Amino acid sequence: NAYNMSIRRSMAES
């Protein structure tokens, strides 16, 4: 499942 970690989501709208 690549949804969670194929991009960094810790602060993707900061």
Partner: antibody
């Protein structure tokens, strides 16, 4: 399954604008960012930016900030990429992607006439 | 921005051998214990296909012949064994810091 269907290839004139689309099926676009990428054979792959269709939030790479405008419509499950004031360096294949960056559209070729 | 450099630019390999492609980032792509490096395969006229995400995770639908290793600035894609269908260009991509960036590609051919 998830499909990203991109709009047809376009021949565009210098100084003109063009708006590309990415119609998503089998996935609610409110559920993830949509990303846009550019590819040229010499300069390779570049990330243009991402849009959050749930709130309209956008983040661009600085080189695309005054060239590209990303929009989206959850009502039609479609994301758009508007390219403005086109010049030769804008000729490229443009891709959309989602599900992180796992699922990609087939690409739209933009060619710029002389 | 993070600059990704692949090595080699082109690789000719014998059917059935192992091959490794290197991707080096100019700054760390690590955050909170994870490494945000992806690997893609692309064949002419087709979109890039995700092979590996977060350095070492095999994408659903991709054969286990592909694996990824590394952390920080240094990453590798390993193909074991190489098969005819593997002829393609391979790209690394970091998604740790905006803007996301891609390596310059490595073109793999069969001898």
């Amino acid at each position: 399954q998830v499909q990203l269907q991109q709009s047809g290839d376009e021949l565009v004139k210098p100084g003109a604008s063009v708006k590309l689309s990415c119609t998503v099926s089998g996935f609610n676009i409110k559920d993830d960012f949509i990303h846009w990428m550019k590819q040229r054979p010499e300069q390779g792959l570049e990330w243009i930016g991402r849009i959050d269709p749930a709130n309209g939030y956008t983040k661009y790479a600085p080189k695309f900030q005054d060239k590209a405008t990303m929009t989206a419509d959850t009502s039609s499950n479609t994301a758009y990429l508007q390219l403005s004031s086109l010049a030769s360096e804008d000729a490229a294949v443009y891709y959309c992607a989602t599900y992180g960056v796992a699922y990609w559209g087939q690409g739209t070729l933009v060619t710029v006439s002389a | 921005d993070i600059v990704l450099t692949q090595s080699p630019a082109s690789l000719a390999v014998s059917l059935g051998q192992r091959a490794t492609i290197s991707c080096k980032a100019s700054q760390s792509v690590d955050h909170d214990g994870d490494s945000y490096m992806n690997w893609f395969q692309q064949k002419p006229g087709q979109s890039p296909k995700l092979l590996i995400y977060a350095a070492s995770n095999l994408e659903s639908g991709i054969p286990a012949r592909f694996s990824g290793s590394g952390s920080g600035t240094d990453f590798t894609l390993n193909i074991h064994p190489v098969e005819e269908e593997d002829a393609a260009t391979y790209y690394c991509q970091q998604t740790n810091e905006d803007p996301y960036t891609f390596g310059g590609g490595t073109k793999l051919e069969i001898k």
